[PDB]
Design a protein around this nucleic acid. Sequence first.
RNA 1: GGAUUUUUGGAGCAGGGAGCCACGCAUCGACCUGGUAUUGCAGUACCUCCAGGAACGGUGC
Lengths: 85, 67, 423, 80, 162, 94, 74, 85, 79, 82
Amino acid sequence: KSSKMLQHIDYRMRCILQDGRIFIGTFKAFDKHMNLILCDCDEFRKIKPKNSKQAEREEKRVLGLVLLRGENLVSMTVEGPPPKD
Amino acid sequence: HPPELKKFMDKKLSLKLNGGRHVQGILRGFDPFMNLVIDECVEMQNNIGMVVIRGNSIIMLEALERV
Amino acid sequence: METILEQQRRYHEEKERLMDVMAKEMLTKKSTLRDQINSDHRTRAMQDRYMEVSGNLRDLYDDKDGLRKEELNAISGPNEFAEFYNRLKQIKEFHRKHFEELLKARENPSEEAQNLVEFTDEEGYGRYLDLHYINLKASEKLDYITYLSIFDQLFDIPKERKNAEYKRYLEMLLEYLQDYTDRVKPLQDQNELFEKKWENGTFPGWPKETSSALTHAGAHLDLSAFSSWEELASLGLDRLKSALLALGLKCGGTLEERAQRLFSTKGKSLESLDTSLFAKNPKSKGTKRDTERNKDIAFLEAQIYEYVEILGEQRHLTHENVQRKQARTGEEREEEEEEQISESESEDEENIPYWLYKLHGLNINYNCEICGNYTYRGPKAFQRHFAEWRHAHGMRCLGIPNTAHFANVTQIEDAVSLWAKLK
Amino acid sequence: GVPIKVLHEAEGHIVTCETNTGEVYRGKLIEAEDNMNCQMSNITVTYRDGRVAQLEQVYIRGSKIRFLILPDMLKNMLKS
Amino acid sequence: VKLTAELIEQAAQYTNAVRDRELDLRGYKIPVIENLGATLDQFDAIDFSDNEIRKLDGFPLLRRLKTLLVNNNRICRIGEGLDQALPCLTELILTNNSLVELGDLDPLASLKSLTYLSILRNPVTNKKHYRLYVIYKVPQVRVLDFQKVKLKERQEAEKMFK
Amino acid sequence: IRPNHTIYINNMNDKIKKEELKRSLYALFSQFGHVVDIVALKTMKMRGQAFVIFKELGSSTNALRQLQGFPFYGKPMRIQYAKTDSDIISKMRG
Amino acid sequence: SLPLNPKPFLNGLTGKPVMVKLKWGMEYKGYLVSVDGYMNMQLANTEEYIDGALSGHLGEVLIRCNNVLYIRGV
Amino acid sequence: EEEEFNTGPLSVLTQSVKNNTQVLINCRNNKKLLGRVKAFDRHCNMVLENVKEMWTEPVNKDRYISKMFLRGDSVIVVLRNPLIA
Amino acid sequence: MVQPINLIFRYLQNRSRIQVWLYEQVNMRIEGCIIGFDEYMNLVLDDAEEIHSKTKSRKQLGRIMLKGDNITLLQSVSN
Amino acid sequence: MKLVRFLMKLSHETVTIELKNGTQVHGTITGVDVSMNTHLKAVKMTLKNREPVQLETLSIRGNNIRYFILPDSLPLDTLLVD
RNA sequence: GGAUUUUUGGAGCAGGGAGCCACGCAUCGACCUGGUAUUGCAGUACCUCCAGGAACGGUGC
């Protein structure tokens, strides 16, 4: 089917980098190498929150429109549904 | 493909290599793998002459001239 | 030095200018205020609101004004927002800021640079103008907020506050429940819960995925709320809610049942016989632990609650939209999408070849020997070169006289014996 | 690749680049090759210690790039 | 000729001679510093020379701004919250402006990274003890008016004003 | 030596580090016009000297007359019009 | 010698005692049984020298090509 | 290709599958996997049976894994022996 | 223009003694006389040495084939 | 022969995968592709030195896999047939 | 379809101790006090020398 990536397209996605960073953005495009296009993308370092009572967000950075090279990608999970816009 | 480096031919350059290594010299040529020939090369300083840098280990280059 | 009188003066004057601007706005389209005020009504109950007739007929006194579209109303509301920001700033600095020999002393220095030929009509005009973009009439936005763009605040599916996009959260939710038994509409049915959201929870309120989701969603709803109602004092609302959170809970959990007694919000999720045991439970190690770990979540839950209440009309409006689009056909859904799109991207105020050079014979390597061993790229080019200034200069200055006998020349040598054959 | 076409689209725009070593280069993208080799100009570089520098002309190998930030001017390839 | 977003967007932008990103805002007759938000904190240097600014104030939070060239303007006062909007301000050139009283230079004490300061051709320069006053009140300065702040001057400024 | 876009400065305190010298030079000379570039080396030959290049020629002349003998890092600088045209100027002109 | 290339050199060294250094600093001495196109390597009666000291006597061994730093005849 | 699997260095794997013999795999993770080769490929991906994984942490450790797939890049060395015997 | 491969072909012909910078290992470099090489930049070095920049110590190797994987840089030495 | 083909047959199996970066992944395979890119559902993933997190879905770039621990039940001799 | 720019890996491993404060070894760099040389028309790894100071920065183990 080839769909396994195409399914998650347009969705908000949590992507894990090889150094251990967390990139969360809107998954808009990919390719053979898994180079990824991430709209409205932010970077997290310390945590991926599961409602951490102290705070959910530390070392968050707004990046914006991001192209990530697939070499440095480890994994991806669904973070939230597509924004309608 | 070739790397688009004709613009940088016979110019003095600053080369950042892996291992936190840095050298400076004049670009004398290249191939599709981005292996370089660098003349009058200097290890950052000690003069090492004309050398081959394997494109594999090239992080970044910066021109010390205007192209 | 600088006479504070002048500064404070300019301040009061600018404040006056701004008040006048946002008043002119409220004048052309009363909705701007009306809209705002109505919402305010349901947040601060005391607020007095105008006669309904005025609201409907879109009039302030006698004249009924033309109805404006949503995008413009919202725009001007955000513009007025920044205006009110400026005003608040100036008011602040002002609060922080508030002989004859010296008169002649300064009047003397005023003689400085007498030859200053220049017309100066730019103090009140540049301000009045600064708060009132195009050449004449193209963009309603004032020079003050000329780079203000709503589309960078609202997505297309929100339609400047008409709807709130919850599909995304339906996705995340599917990811949370680890199944697919949940439809967009069943998800909205879940949201409606927000006592229910407390005693009939979609999931266990101590579940991680769930609490995280709830956080993200809450944040969204709140930002949407204040986004769609710029004109209302955000800080006021925030503080109101916070105080309701602190004060309502403390005595009895604000949630009381004639049967089970007093419920604890978020941290413990247990009832209590009487207020007495309830109070002596708020110091126990258990409640300390919970209130110390699940505080942010409980508070966020609460916010989701009250903000969703304040937005009941938008929630309903969207749910409706969902059902509609859902009951559309293909063509219908497509045309509707077209409409939402147009509303989104609309002004807030309306008014060579090789196959030919090879065929022709050009771009082919060739050389003339007598001319600088020059290179020529075409064979047609050579005849032109022969009937040429420089080619004849090489011949004649070489001693080989011009014109038509020597035409076929290439090398310098042969035409020398040819010219010896001539003379 | 689809991302590659979008990269070439950013030629002539101001972009940010992080290397594999975490140095951060911001400036005008002159040329982007298919393999992600990047020629840029009038750069600001922010090292891992936080310090900044200024460079006129740079060229970074595609492999040794971790990522790039492109303008939002591009966001508006929605077909795929 | 208000300093506007539109003005900043068409302004010459380049890498200067000391290798920093600089924005050229020279000779526009700007009277008030405002709307800097639109530069997006992308400059290491901003050149405001030859304008009509009266007060060094009105800046948004600009984390990358390290050099401010403010030559030939009419600066007579320095804003009080400057470090809160310009934390890494390292060089401030105020040559040929209107600062007249030593006390008007007081707000520069709050710029923790300020190392290069130039106030030449300002009336304040001729005030008795002007140099020692600056040294004691703005000790973070290392070069004042293109002359090295030396230890002996620091000590001398410690006596007077102790 | 005719008026030139570039001025040649000598008699400068050579103890200042090169990058600091160039940055103070830039600061000082910005008052007269945009300085395009500054060439200063610490070799034996070139130490204590610098070439300051301005976009406008009037700026170079004004700088020369107004800062002649200006105390800079302790010494009075000596300014003069450069002998030749600066490479950057030649490239910007043609 | 008149040009002696990688491939023939290694082929000449088959049937011989070799030592291979790996990138990770381990060393393996044994008789080179064979090599392949990708320069994977097969040793017999292998011995392991770590820190240049005899560590383990291992027998027959495959070394994946990407691990190899260099090979020496010995 | 079979010839190169049969006679080349990979014959170590070819021989282990045919004889159902044990081999120790020194591994990139600093772990060693001791077991039988059910299948292998060019990259030295393997399907392994009766795997004893051994490592160190000083403290030695081990654990039994009946059935598993190894991606071949992690291979450092593969050892055949009088181990099975 | 000089192509990098050709430089090597030159090194080969010259029998200049060569010093190689290795990949991600700074404390050791390798030396030798290139006798031949292949399409992968794998080198056959004669009378080769490990050079410890930290210890100022040399390890004698003789006939070496160095995989090209490790090559960062190729330089010539007078010795 | 091409063992990725074997892995591609393991849809709807539950496995434990150990990653190159030490992370441990337990979930149900929805798909393995030719690059060994692996997709799962009902995933309990434990990064080295954390407590597990549960994800409804997770997608792994193939190269980042160290090894798969397969169900003891798995009938390998069946799956090795082409 | 495992040989330099992506998917058959250059990865792997090493930090507590002493009473909020302070820290082993090696290499390189500005760097800071004094004093001292040099007056020279350029396009730059770097740039006088002499003595003293480093509770300085970066990298590796």
